[PDB]
Design a protein around this ligand. Structure first.
Ligand SMILES: [Mg+2]
Ligand SMILES: [Mg+2]
Ligand SMILES: [Mg+2]
Ligand SMILES: [Mg+2]
Lengths: 68, 110, 80, 174
RNA sequence: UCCUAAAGAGUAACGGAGGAGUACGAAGGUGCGCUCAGACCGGUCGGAAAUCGGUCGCAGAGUAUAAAGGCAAAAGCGCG
RNA sequence: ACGGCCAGGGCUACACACGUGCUACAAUGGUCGGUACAAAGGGUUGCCAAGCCGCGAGGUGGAGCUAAUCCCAUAAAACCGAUCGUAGUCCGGAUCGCAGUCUGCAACUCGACUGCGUGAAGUCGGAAUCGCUAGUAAUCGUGAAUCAGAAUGUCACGGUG
C-alpha cells in the first residue's frame, strides 16, 4: 500500500435502531448510527410478504352477502 | 434510507413526510398526531430518537416501491380481463368517462 | 355506485336462466340482451353472449371478473 | 472481521458439505472489483475527478481511471479518452469492504430481493449492480451528484457456479 | 510494393493492381515489467455492443504511414 | 309501412382546427384557530329541525309548519393571532388505483358527490382581438327555474369596490 495515496482508514462503530453494534473499519473517522441493518430489513426478517395478488372473490363476499 | 426515501430539510414535519410517496397531507397529520412529533418544529430540530417511530408508522401504510407495483398490478387486472375501462386505458383515452371529442389532451400530449 | 344497503343486482330472467342452467352444465352460450347485471360467484366459468348492439359476442367468465358488470366486456363503438 | 468468521466456521463446514477431500480445496473469494462506469458525459472533463473522489471514499483506496481501446461512433468519439474508473480489493480490504455488504448495504438496493441467485458465470464468478451512490458511509446527499453507475463484481476460486452458490449462501445476501 | 518474371540477379509493352514529394525532442537510446484479435456467461438508466470479472484462446490483432516480406531475443504495450 | 309496440346500442366516439365558459400559474397570497354584517326566493303530495351514530358524503329520528311564527340557512370576501419565505412550492388541481353514500327496476358504455394515495401541463401567455364611462369594471357569496339524480352554462339578489 502506497503511503500518501489512500485516505485515512480508521475504526468506527455502526449502531442500528435496534442497537446492533457493528465494529467496521472505514474512512468515516466518526461513528454514525443507521436506521436499518441486515437484521432489521423486512426481506431478511421475513416481513416482506407478497403483493396479495387479487381477491375479488373475497371482496365480493365481504361486500355483498347474497343469501341463497 | 432516511425514511424509505430522502427527505428534505428546513421544512415542517407534515410537509417533509408528504414526499414519502404514499402519505399525503391528511395521513401525515394523523401520523404526527399518533407519534407526538410537533409539526411546528423543523425536521432539523427533531432528535434522532422518534424517527424510528416515524419509520414504523411509514411501515404500516405503504412504501412507494410496492405501491407502484401493486397499483400497476391493479391496472394489469383490468388490462388482462377485456373490460372497457382497460380497453380505453391501453389506447390512452380517458377512463372515467370524460369527453373525447376535444380537450382530452392530458392523456395524449401536445 | 349501488350502495351496500342494497348490495347485489341480477336480472330475474338471467338469474332463473343461469341458476337452473348450472344444474345442466355448460353446453351452450347464454344469449341475453341485459348488460346492467353484475356477474356473481355462482356464475364463474359460464359463456354469456352479451349484446354488442347489432350481434351477440361471447364472454369467457373468469374468477377475476366477479366485481365488474357484463357490459364492460362488450364494445359499443369500433374506431378501427 | 469476516475473515475470522470464514476461517472458523465456513472453511471447516464447506469441506464436509461439498464432499471435498482436504482442507484447502474449499472455494474462497478471490477479489472484488467495482468498476464504476463513467460512460455518460464523455466529452466533459469535469465528472471524472468527481467520480474518482466519490469512489475513493467508499473504498478507502484511490481508484484508477480507465481509457478506451476502440471507438464506437454510435457511443462516442475517442476525444473523451477516459471512460472508466476501476478499483481492486484483495484480502486486507476485501473482507472489510464485504462487511458493508450483508450487514449495512443490504439497506442499499431499495429492493424486493437482495440479489438474484440466477446471475453467475460458467466458472462461478458473481456480479451485481448498485443503482445509487447515496448508499455508503461518509457521503453527503446535498454535495453528492446522483450520476454514479457502480457495479460490484466478485471473483471466486470455484470450478462451477454451484460451489459459488454454496460459498455465497454462508455470508448470504440473496 | 506485388504480378507478368519462366523456383539465383535482370528482363519490355499506351500490360494488370496500389502509394510517396511526410511525420516523431518522443513515435530515438538504455534498464525493468505485460499480453493480442475474436467467442461465451454474469453485471443498475448503456446493451449486438462503452467500463468490469471469468473462461475458451494458442497472433485469425498491432506496426505512424500504400502493398510485400518479417516480428515469444516479440520489432507490440507501460514505467524510471 | 316513410305508420305503430318492446329490448339493447347511439346522440357524451376522436391524430385534428374553431367559439364561449371555469380553474389556475401564487406572498395585494396558501393553510390552521377564533369572530361581523346581507338581500331575494322555496316549502301541508313539501320543507324535513333537535338529539343521535359516522374521518366525511350521510343514516336514524320525528318536531314545528301552511307562514314576520317552523325549516331551507352556516352567507363569503374583510377584520384578529400563528406558520409558510416565492421553491414547479403547505401553488395548481387534471389524471389514475382502492373504498363508499344518495337517487333511480336499473350508475359498464353513461351520473353527482364523499374518504385515502398519485401527482401532470401551467412561471401571465405571438400575429391579432374583445367588454366596460359609476354602485360601472374587478372580485366573493347566497337562493331558484328545468329537475327521481345530475351545472363551470343559465334563473335572481346582495357584500368590498
Ligand atoms: Mg527471378
Ligand atoms: Mg528463371
Ligand atoms: Mg516501434
Ligand atoms: Mg335538480
Amino acid at each position: 500500500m502506497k503511503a500518501d495515496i489512500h485516505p485515512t482508514y480508521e475504526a468506527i462503530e455502526a449502531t442500528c435502531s435496534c442497537g446492533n453494534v457493528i465494529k467496521t473499519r472505514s474512512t468515516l473517522c466518526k461513528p454514525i448510527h443507521l436506521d436499518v441493518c441486515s437484521e432489521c430489513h423486512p426481506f431478511y426478517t421475513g416481513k416482506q410478504k407478497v403483493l396479495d395478488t387479487g381477491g375479488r372473490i373475497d371482496r365480493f363476499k365481504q361486500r355483498f352477502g347474497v343469501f341463497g | 434510507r432516511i425514511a424509505g426515501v430522502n427527505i428534505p430539510d428546513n421544512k415542517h414535519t407534515v410537509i417533509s413526510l408528504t414526499y414519502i410517496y404514499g402519505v399525503g397531507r391528511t395521513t401525515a397529520q394523523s401520523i404526527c398526531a399518533a407519534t407526538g412529533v410537533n409539526p411546528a418544529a423543523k425536521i432539523k430540530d427533531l432528535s434522532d430518537e422518534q424517527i424510528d417511530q416515524l419509520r414504523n408508522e411509514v411501515a404500516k401504510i405503504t412504501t412507494e416501491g410496492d405501491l407502484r407495483r401493486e397499483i400497476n398490478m391493479n391496472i394489469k387486472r383490468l388490462m388482462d380481463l377485456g373490460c372497457y375501462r382497460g380497453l380505453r386505458h391501453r389506447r390512452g383515452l380517458p377512463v372515467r368517462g370524460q369527453r373525447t371529442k376535444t380537450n382530452a389532451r392530458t392523456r395524449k400530449g401536445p | 355506485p349501488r350502495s351496500l344497503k342494497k348490495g347485489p343486482f341480477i336480472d330475474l330472467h338471467l338469474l332463473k336462466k343461469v341458476e337452473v342452467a348450472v344444474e345442466k352444465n355448460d353446453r351452450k352460450p347464454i344469449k341475453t340482451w341485459s348488460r346492467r347485471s353484475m356477474i356473481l360467484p355462482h356464475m364463474v366459468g359460464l359463456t354469456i353472449a352479451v349484446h354488442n348492439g347489432r350481434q351477440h359476442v361471447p364472454v369467457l367468465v373468469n374468477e377475476d371478473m366477479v366485481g365488474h358488470k357484463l357490459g364492460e366486456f362488450a364494445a359499443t363503438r369500433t374506431y378501427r | 472481521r469476516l475473515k475470522e468468521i470464514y476461517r472458523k466456521e465456513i472453511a471447516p463446514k464447506l469441506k464436509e458439505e461439498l464432499q471435498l477431500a482436504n482442507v484447502m480445496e474449499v472455494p474462497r473469494v478471490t477479489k472484488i472489483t467495482l468498476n464504476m462506469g463513467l460512460g455518460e458525459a464523455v466529452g466533459d472533463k469535469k465528472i471524472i475527478e468527481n467520480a474518482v473522489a466519490d469512489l475513493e471514499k467508499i473504498t478507502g483506496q484511490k481508484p484508477v481511471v480507465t481509457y478506451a481501446r476502440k471507438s464506437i461512433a454510435g457511443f462516442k468519439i475517442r476525444e473523451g479518452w477516459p471512460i472508466g474508473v476501476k478499483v481492486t480489493l484483495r484480502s486486507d480490504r476485501m473482507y472489510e469492504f464485504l462487511d458493508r455488504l450483508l450487514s449495512i448495504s443490504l439497506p442499499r438496493v431499495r429492493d424486493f430481493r437482495g440479489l438474484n441467485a440466477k446471475s453467475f458465470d460458467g466458472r462461478g464468478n458473481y456480479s451485481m449492480g448498485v443503482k445509487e451512490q447515496i448508499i455508503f458511509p461518509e457521503i453527503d446527499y446535498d454535495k453528492i451528484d446522483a450520476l454514479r453507475g457502480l457495479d460490484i463484481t466478485l471473483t471466486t476460486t470455484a470450478r462451477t457456479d454451484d460451489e459459488g452458490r454454496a460459498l455465497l449462501r454462508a455470508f448470504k445476501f440473496p
